[PDB]
């Protein structure tokens, strides 16, 4: 199996619903809200000539703009020409942004999963970025030596052509190397080792991809002794 450093995923915060807009946009919309409502007030109460005929004031205007913004309707409408011609602009302003909001929240509420890097070791043969090695005096290392599958052959070519040594001397040495490499040195070991390292703290490692073959542990005796068949 292949063991690499687990990428640190981001957790959604408390205010994770204001996400599909940026804080600049959120302040600009507030500024524009204030400006539109006060301009509507100015055009409303302007001594038309009698004076208390129109119904708009600062306060009426302040929540008129809001009830126009969120689709809740209103109670009254501008009746002067210029009041109508500014309210139409505010209507056109909301129809873009709130549609953008819903349509993008639909995008945020589909996927949260990471794109899953160098999987199935073929890009370990293809790229030259992330290094990888094995355990010295090891059956895996001898397996890549004697291997005849061409992708494994190129992997063995890269491993023997290494600057510096991609190999290590012990398992925990390679463990610490991958825990410090920051996504730059992959490691190869056996699946049982891999899952045991996964089930420990700090859990910063991660198994990727599938398996490669079917090995097996067994009991070893000197050739021909009497212990063989009873064991």
């Amino acid at each position: 199996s292949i063991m690499i450093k687990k990428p640190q995923k981001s957790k959604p915060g408390v205010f994770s619903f204001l996400d599909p807009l940026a804080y600049e946009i959120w302040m600009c919309i507030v500024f524009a809200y204030i400006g539109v409502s006060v301009v509507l007030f100015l055009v409303s109460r302007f001594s038309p000539y009698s004076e208390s005929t129109n119904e708009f004031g600062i306060f009426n205007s302040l929540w008129f703009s809001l009830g126009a913004f969120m689709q809740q309707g209103c109670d009254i409408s501008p009746r002067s020409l210029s009041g109508r011609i500014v309210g139409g602009v505010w209507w056109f302003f909301t129809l873009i942004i709130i549609s953008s909001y819903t349509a993008n929240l639909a995008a945020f509420l589909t996927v949260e999963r990471m794109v899953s890097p160098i999987e199935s070791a073929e890009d370990l043969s293809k790229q030259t970025e992330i290094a990888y090695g094995t355990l010295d005096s090891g059956s895996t290392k001898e397996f890549f030596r004697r291997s005849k599958i061409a992708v494994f052959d190129k992997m063995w070519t890269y491993m023997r052509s290494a600057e510096p040594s991609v190999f290590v001397r012990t398992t925990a040495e390679g463990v610490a190397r991958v825990r410090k490499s920051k996504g730059k040195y992959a490691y190869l070991l056996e699946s049982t080792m891999n899952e045991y390292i996964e089930q420990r703290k700090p859990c910063d490692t991660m198994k990727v991809g599938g398996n490669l073959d079917s090995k097996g542990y067994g009991i070893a005796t000197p050739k021909g002794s009497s212990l063989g068949t009873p064991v």
Partner: protein
């Protein structure tokens, strides 16, 4: 002449061309052309909307100003017939 045909028949040319052009896909778009990022809306996307908003504000304010300018100091039912005939 015979040897090159042996190579073309057995696909060694294909294998070597793959080794020296396609296994070394390194820079950018070949590797990262089939990935996905979701979004995050920035202000640089939406700026003309704000521009239209502020311009409409100024236009409306100008309209009210000239309305008050007029009412500080159609026509001839009759020649409306002239206007509609020439319009037709």
């Amino acid at each position: 002449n015979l040897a090159v045909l042996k190579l073309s028949e057995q696909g060694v040319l294909d294998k070597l061309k793959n080794k020296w052009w396609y296994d070394k896909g390194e820079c950018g778009a070949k590797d990262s052309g089939s990935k996905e990022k979701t979004s995050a809306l920035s202000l640089s996307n939406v700026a003309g909307v704000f521009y239209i908003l502020v311009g409409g504000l100024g236009l409306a304010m100008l309209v009210a100003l000239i309305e008050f300018c007029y009412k500080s100091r159609l026509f001839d039912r009759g020649v409306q017939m002239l206007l509609t005939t020439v319009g037709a």
